[PDB]
Amino acid sequence: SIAQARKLVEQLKMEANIDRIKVSKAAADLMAYCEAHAKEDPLLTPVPASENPFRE
Amino acid sequence: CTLSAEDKAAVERSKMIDRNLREDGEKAAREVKLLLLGAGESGKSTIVKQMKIITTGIVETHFTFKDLHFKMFDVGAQRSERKKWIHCFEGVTAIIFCVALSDYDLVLAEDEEMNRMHESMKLFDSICNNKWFTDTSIILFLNKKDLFEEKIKKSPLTICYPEYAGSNTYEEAAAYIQCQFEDLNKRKDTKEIYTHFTCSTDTKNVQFVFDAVTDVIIKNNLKDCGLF
Amino acid sequence: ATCKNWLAAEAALEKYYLSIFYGIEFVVGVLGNTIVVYGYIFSLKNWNSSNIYLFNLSVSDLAFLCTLPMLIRSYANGNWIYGDVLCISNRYVLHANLYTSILFLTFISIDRYLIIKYPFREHLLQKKEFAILISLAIWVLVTLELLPILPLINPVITDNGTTCNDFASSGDPNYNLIYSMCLTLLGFLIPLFVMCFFYYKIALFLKQRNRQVATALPLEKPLNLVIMAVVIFSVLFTPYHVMRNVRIASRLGSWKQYQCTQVVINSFYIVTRPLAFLNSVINPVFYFLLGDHFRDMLMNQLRH
Amino acid sequence: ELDQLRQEAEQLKNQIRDARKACADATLSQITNNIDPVGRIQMRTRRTLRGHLAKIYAMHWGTDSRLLVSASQDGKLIIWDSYTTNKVHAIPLRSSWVMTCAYAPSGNYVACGGLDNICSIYNLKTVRVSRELAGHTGYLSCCRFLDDNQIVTSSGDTTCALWDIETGQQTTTFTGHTGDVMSLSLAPDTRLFVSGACDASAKLWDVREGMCRQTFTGHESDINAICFFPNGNAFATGSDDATCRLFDLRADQELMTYSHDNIICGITSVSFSKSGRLLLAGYDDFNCNVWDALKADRAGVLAGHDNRVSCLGVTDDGMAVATGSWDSFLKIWN
Ligand SMILES: O=C(O)[C@H]1O[C@H]1C(=O)O
């Protein structure tokens, strides 16, 4: 098929021109984000009672 | 133990909602749900018209015969992967599987060297021994009789099955086909298959469906009571 | 004359037969009923009327069986070593559970009916509330029925003697006979007739539906089970109720003891006593473990 | 010519693979080697919503952390109140085959869909079918409100669509998948979104256009769930492969795989925990598993259901997690 192969080639060519950052520069960012919001996660560090909505 | 006006109003609303939900559930628990299946165009069009009194996906039909309200779900317009939505039909009472007898010496238009009877057998095998359906009964409708009967002569059944060794009479060719379809059941100890050579232009299909459904219901009730 | 041997036979039949049979029944019934109850508790949900009735029957069987261990120490030591209050409580609970089991069986038979007629549970008596209401009514009615047994069950205490007399061998034989006949009529004959009637109707339905269907598996197993239930109930219960009244009437005013005959009758009553208790052991199997559904589910939940 | 294009496509694929391989100097398992473990995560069932009469297929929270909407295959869509066990709304559907739910960010509307190939939008006024969008040719499998007048739907005909609720017209169509699309997730800024399909692949689409910017592969089977990392730089994938996989947009490759030898069931949903340090995945074995997203270590297990876990959701504040199931039970854990 000369109609679908052209679209596939165009799509493949359009995705190979993207700039990529080195790995270990994106894992560091994930680690930093996880570290900077540690105290705002009630599931990681549970909040004391009288602050939990479903204490009951 | 103190409650405000707003809290009491909310509780009253929740109780009314729950009451309506229970009423709806009890009302909908008295309906028989059947799943209509078929390969290609074996039927599902004359069957539905014969049984109805009251690509868009599921198509739903109501009808009552003596005291039972049947809902039939035709899902032949779903040209999607059958593996990702079949489990929605796990609790249906029975599966009505339609197979056309005349499609024993024809091939699919989109692909040759492929009998339609073999495709129907493949689909029946896949659905009968499929999970989610280890305790669901099947009503097999062998449609398009009197055209296979008059087409059997001058066109031997060996075109479909090259092993058949017998006369060309309709009375035994039909029995051979029915047995070949019934032999695909690998759960003979937990499932039943009701077969009907449904070329009855009268109201004989609805009667057969009613009888099979009542038998299924009685067997289920006896099973739940310890008897079977 | 010709009944000294009868006396020895009666003594041995009281001392050994009753103890061994009661022990065997205790162990087997306790095992089965405990299995059934724990299967119903932490393994089954969506309770319906039939489940309520069956659970009540199992509870009654277990309660009846709990009264046996204190009766097996006796018949071996030759006397009742516990307090009079304990004796009265033991016999009262034994009889109350014995006569509650019958009503629960009758209502199970009635519930088997009303499901061939109303397969969608669309009847008033099939509501889960009516089941519990009727269970409470049954318990209270049986307790009220057994209330007038207290005067007779009163124990015997005298010089160098502390013995508990069974129901048939206590109190005034006239009032005792009248009460025994009333208890028989109210607690055995009427429930038996109701059960027989409803099971006969169910069997007729099964026979009519079996021979007028398409080519399908016949309804032969349920008919056999329906017949077996009635057969077992009648066989296990009738001789005991006949012999109890015969013995009670044997020691009335017009005895005449023409051939010291009041030894054979007591022996027959003793032999028939432990047969009736066999229903408590049998019921678990017949009503729960004979069905593939319940045993399969219980095993699956036992595997955790 | 056919070969002139096939060879070019193969060359482009090889070049892309080599370019993305020559970028993995390290891995997200050596950097986090010294990171201390999160420990043992233990949660208790705080609430049990008990209204549905059949299997539950979808669930959503809404930007309030109080009310949530649940859909079951009994023709009912129930809006609850988490802090209590009250029912605020119960909507009867025209079709009882529903596989999706959505709560508007403003709380005014809700949406549903299923085997009828139609997306129905109900107006809560905070009850009445406000709109019915019908342009797909396959069962809907997901839907997410972008605004009060925009919605993104995904269908089993291997396509996604961006609609216009006011007029009902299909504003844009996203194509490229070669299989049913089973999930989609909106980026926090609602400028891009990812979709996972049954061809064992995921794609990143720009909402303002109709072009796929990146394609991520590596799963060995269908993908049933998708989730975005809280900062919108990465995403999570749930599949039957029993291999939870984290991928990055900027690096354009896979980072970590979450799997165990004793797990053989497929994953039916995934979700994060407001910080990206925990990944909660629902399984077919009635269990939910909490993984340490930075170390790929199973932190904990939630087991309170008995038929399956078809829907999992975390409160916006990560205060609690609602878990609906085919057992018609919505369990809220904290
Ligand atoms: O026969 C027994 O010893 C027990 O049934 C109790 C009684 O009749 O006293």
The chain D residue lying nearest B55, using CA atoms, is D137
Element housing D239 (H / E): strand D234-239
Distance, C-alpha C101 to centroid of its chain: 5
Angstrom distance (rounded) from CA D191 to CA D189: 6
The number of beta carbons lying within 10 Å of the beta carbon of residue B188 is 10
Write down which chains contact chain D via at least 3 CB pairs under 8 A.
Answer: A, B
Nearest to C120 among B30, B223, B226 (CB): B30
Judging contact as 3 or more Cβ pairs under 8 Å, the answer for B and C is yes
Alpha-carbon gap, residue D233 to D235, rounded angstroms:
7
Interface contact A26-D317, CB threshold 8 A: no
DSSP state of B191: -
The DSSP code sequence of chain C is ---HHHHHHHHHIIIIIHHHHHHHHHHHHHHHHHHHHHHHHSS--S--HHHHHHHHHHHHHHHHHHTSHHHHHTTTSSS--S-HHHHHHHHHHHHHHHHHHHHHHHHHHHHHTTSSS-TT--SGGGSHHHHHHHHHHHHHHHHHHHGGGHHHH--EEETTEEE---GGGSS-HHHHHHHHHHHHIIIIIHHHHHHHHHHHHHHHHHHHHHTTSSSS--S-HHHHHHHHHHHHHHHHHHHHHHHHHHHHHHTSSS---TTS-TTHHHHHHHHHHHHHTHHHHHHHIIIIITSHHHHHHHHHHHT-
Report whether D139 contacts D156 (CB < 8 A).
yes
Name every residue whose Cβ is closer than 8 Å to that of residue D285 and which is 6 or more positions away in sequence: D263, D265
Centre of ligand 1 from the C-alpha of residue C167, in Å: 6
Q: A17: which 2 tokens? A: 């021109």
Dihedral-angle region of residue B57 (phi above 0 means left; psi in -120 to 50 means alpha; beta otherwise):
left
Say how many CB pairs under 8 Å bridge A and D.
155
> Residue D189: is it exposed, middle or buried by C-beta count within 10 angstroms (0-12/13-18/19+)?
exposed
B143 CB-near residues (< 8 Å, 6+ apart): B42, B43, B46, B47, B98, B99, B100, B101, B198, B199
Report the sign of the C-alpha dihedral through residues D284, D289, D292, D298, in that order. negative
* Interchain proximity B211–C214, CB inside 8 Å: yes
Residue C168 alpha carbon, nearest atom of ligand 1: 8
Q: Six-digit token pair at B83?
A: 């593996």
Read off φ and ψ for residue D120, nearest 5 degrees: -100, 130
Phi, psi dihedral angles at D156 (to 5 degrees): -75, 0
Sequence-separated (6 or more) residues with CB below 8 Å from residue A36 = none
Give the full edge-to-edge strand order of the sheet including D159-163.
Answer: D140-145, D151-155, D159-163, D170-174
* Distance of alpha carbon B189 from alpha carbon B173, whole angstroms: 27
D86/B contact by beta carbon, under 8 A: yes
- Mark yes or no for CB contact B226/C217 under 8 Å: no
Taking the CA atoms of B146, B151, B152 and B158 in sequence, report the sign of the dihedral they define.
Answer: negative
Beta bridge partners of D289: D281, D301
Rounded Cα–Cα distance for residues C224 and C129 (Å): 31
Between D51, D86, D179, which is nearest B21 by CB? Answer: D51
| Cβ pair B55:D182 closer than 8 A | no
Asked if the C-beta of A3 comes within 8 angstroms of chain D's C-beta atoms, the answer is no
CB spacing of B29 vs C120 below 8 angstroms: yes
* Total H helices, total E strands in chain B: 6, 6
**Residue whose structure tokens are 């802090």:** D83
* Cβ-Cβ contacts under 8 Å, D83 against chain A: 53-54
Q: Which of C40, C227, C191 is nearest to C101 (CA)?
A: C191
Number of CB atoms found within 10 A of residue D183's CB: 22
**Other residues' Cβ atoms within 10 Å of the Cβ of residue A28:** 14
Cβ-based burial of C19 (10 A; exposed 0-12, middle 13-18, buried ≥19): middle
Residue nearest atom 9 in ligand 1 by C-alpha distance:
C166
**What single letter denotes the amino acid at residue B7?**
D
Whether residue D86 and residue B13 make contact (CB cut-off 8 A), yes or no, is yes
Give which of D20, D30, D319 to mutate to test A binding, by max A Cβ within 10 Å.
D319
Q: Do strands B94-100 and B137-143 pair parallel, antiparallel, or not at all (unpaired)?
A: parallel
Q: Is D193:D205 a contact under the CB 8 Å cutoff?
A: yes
| CA C169 to centroid of ligand 1, rounded, Å | 10
Contact C134, C52 (CB under 8 A): no
Residues D318 and D278: beta-carbon distance below 8 Å:
no
Shortest Cα–Cα distance, D141 to chain A (Å): 26
Resolution in A: 3.2
φ/ψ (deg, to 5) at B103? -85, 60
User: How far separated are the first and last CA of chain A, in Å rounded?
Assistant: 65
Residue D89, beta-bridge partner list: D79
Query: For residue C112, which residues of chain B lie inside 8 Å, CB to CB?
Result: 225, 227
Phi then psi for residue D217, to 5 deg, are: -135, 170
Q: In this structure, what token pair is assigned to residue B60?
A: 């739903």
What is the distance between the alpha carbons of residues C88 and D281, in angstroms, rounded to a whole number? 62
Residues whose CB is less than 8 angstroms from the CB of residue C156 and which lie 6 or more positions away in sequence, other chains included: C162, C163, C164, C165
Distance (Å, whole) CA C122 – CA C127: 8
Determine if residue B15 is left, alpha or beta; phi over 0 gives left, psi from -120 to 50 gives alpha, anything else beta: alpha
- CA nearest to C88, candidates C29, C142, C140, C147: C147
Residue recorded with tokens 């079918």:
D129
B120 closest CA partner among B188, B61, B38, B192: B38
| Contact (Cβ atoms closer than 8 angstroms) between residue D299 and residue D38 | yes
Out of A2, A15, A23, closest to residue D215 by CB: A15
- The CB density around residue A27, as the number of other CB atoms within 10 Å, is 22
C-alpha angle D21/D27/D30, rounded to 5°? 155
Is residue D261 packed enough to be buried (19+ CB in 10 Å), middle (13-18) or exposed (0-12)?
A: exposed
Non-local (6+) Cβ contacts of A24 within 8 A are D25, D26, D27, D31
Distances (CA, A) of C202 to B111, C127, C199, C287, C299: 56, 21, 5, 17, 31
State the chains in contact with B (3 or more Cβ–Cβ pairs under 8 Å). C, D
Residue of B nearest to C51 (CA): B225
Sign of CA dihedral C117, C123, C124, C128: positive
Chain-centroid distance of CA C100 in Å reads: 8
Residue type, A54: F
Method: cryo-EM
* CA distance linking residue C223 with residue B170, whole number of Å: 39
Burial (CB count <10 Å: 0-12, 13-18, 19+), residue D213: middle
Ligand 1 atom closest to C153 (CA): 9
Type of residue at C272: T
H helices of B34-182, where?
Answer: 46-50, 116-128, 148-152, 170-182
Q: Looking at residue D146, which CATH number applies to its domain?
A: 2.130.10.10
CA angle B207, B45, B86 (to 5 degrees): 90
Domains contained in chain D, number: 1
For residue C206, how far is its CA from the centre of ligand 1 (angstroms)?
Answer: 40
Cβ separation D2–A1 shorter than 8 A: yes
Cβ pair C209:B222 closer than 8 A: no
CA of B204 vs chain C CAs: smallest distance (Å): 13
Main-chain phi, psi angles of C238, to 5 degrees: -65, -50
* DSSP code, position A33: H
**Chain-chain contact of B215 with C293 (C-beta, under 8 angstroms):** no
Number of Cβ within 10 Å of residue B197's Cβ equals 19
Instruction: Give the 3-state secondary structure of residue D54.
Output: coil
Tell me the pairing of strands D244-248 and D253-258: antiparallel
What does the alpha-carbon distance between residue D242 and residue D232 come to, in Å, rounded to a whole number?
24
Buried b (16+ CB within 10 A) or exposed e, D125-157: eeeeebbebebbbbbbbbbbbbeeebbbbbbbb
Alpha-carbon distance of D278 to D299, in angstroms, equals 8
3-class DSSP state for residue A25? coil
Rounded to a whole number of angstroms, the distance between the first and last alpha carbons of chain C is 66
Beta-carbon count within 10 A of D103 CB = 23
Closest CA to C170 of C185, C150, C187: C150
Q: What sections of chain D are H helices per DSSP?
A: 2-21
**Radius of gyration for the alpha carbons in chain B, expressed in angstroms and rounded:** 22
D69-72, strands of its sheet edge to edge: D56-60, D69-72, D76-80, D87-92
Q: Is A40 helix (H, G, I), strand (E, B) or coil?
A: coil
Q: Alpha-carbon distance C56 to C43, whole Å?
A: 17
| Sequence-distant (≥ 6) Cβ neighbours of residue C133 within 8 angstroms | none
- Facing residue for D156 by CB, picked from B13, B75, B80: B80
Alpha-carbon distance C104 to C162, whole Å?
36
Give the H/E segment covering residue A7: helix A4-15
Closest atom, ligand 1, to C-alpha of C71: 3
- The conformation of residue B33, written as its DSSP 8-state character, comes to E
Helices (H) then strands (E): counts for chain A: 2, 0
Helix (H, G, I), strand (E, B) or coil at B164: coil
CA of C18 to the centre of ligand 1 (A): 10
**Separation of CA C46 from chain center:** 28
Give the bridge partners for D272, in sequence order. Answer: D279
Nearest CA to ligand 1 atom 3: C166
Strands (E), D93-233: 98-103, 109-114, 119-123, 128-133, 140-145, 151-155, 159-163, 170-174, 181-186, 192-197, 201-206, 212-217, 223-228
CA–CA min distance B212, chain C (Å): 8
Give residue D187's domain range: 1-333
Q: Where are the domains of chain A?
A: 1-56
Hey, what are D201's tokens? 């692949």
Gap between the Cα atoms of B181 and B187, Å rounded? 14
Of C69, C256, C262, the closest CA to residue C169 belongs to C262
Cα separation, D52 vs D70, in Å, equals: 9
DSSP-based three-state secondary structure for D101: strand
Nearest-angstrom CA–CA distance, B126 and D276: 43
Residue C235's alpha-carbon distances to B207, C192, C277, C290, in angstroms, are 44, 11, 12, 20
- Provide the token pair at D209: 């256009």
Tokens of C158: 């005298």
CA distance linking residue C143 with residue C140, whole number of Å: 5
Residue C270 CA: nearest ligand 1 atom is 1
Residue C71 CB less than 6 A away from ligand 1? yes
Residue D299 CA to its chain's centroid (Å):
21
What is chain D's alpha carbon radius of gyration, rounded to the nearest angstrom? 20
Contact status, residue D140 vs residue D119, Cβ threshold 8 Å: yes
- What is the SS3 assignment for B72? strand
Per the rule left: phi > 0, alpha: psi between -120 and 50, beta: everything else, D77 is beta
Which atom of ligand 1 lies closest to the CA of C166?
Answer: 9
For residue D332, which of D302, D310, D307, D306 has the smallest C-alpha distance?
Answer: D302
Put residue D276 in one of left, alpha, beta given phi > 0 → left and psi -120 to 50 → alpha: left
- Report the residue from B14, B79, B84 with minimal CB separation from D87: B14
C-alpha distance from residue D179 to each of A15, D72, D110, D196 (Å) = 20, 25, 27, 10
Task: Please give the Cα distance from D179 to D217 (Å, whole number).
Answer: 14
> Within 13 Å, how many C-alpha atoms sit on residue B25's CB side?
14
The Cα D301–Cα B108 span in angstroms is 51
Ligand 1 pocket residue status of C273, Cβ below 6 Å: yes
Find all residues with CB under 8 Å of D100, minimum gap 6, and list them. Answer: D57, D58, D71, D111, D112, D113, D114, D140, D141, D142, D143
| Residue B112 burial (CB count, 10 A) | 7
Tell me, using a 6 A CB cutoff, whether residue C91 lines ligand 1: yes
Query: Hey, whose CA ends up nearest to atom 8 of ligand 1?
Result: C166
Q: What is the CA radius of gyration of chain C?
A: 22
CA distance D154 to chain B (A): 13
Contact B24 D81 (CB under 8 A): no
Please give the DSSP secondary-structure letter assigned to residue B89: G
Query: Diameter of chain B by CA atoms?
Result: 88
Q: Which residues contact B69 (CB under 8 A, 6 or more apart)?
A: B30, B31, B32, B62, B63
Chain center to CA of C178: 21
Distance C189 CA to ligand 1 centre (A): 21
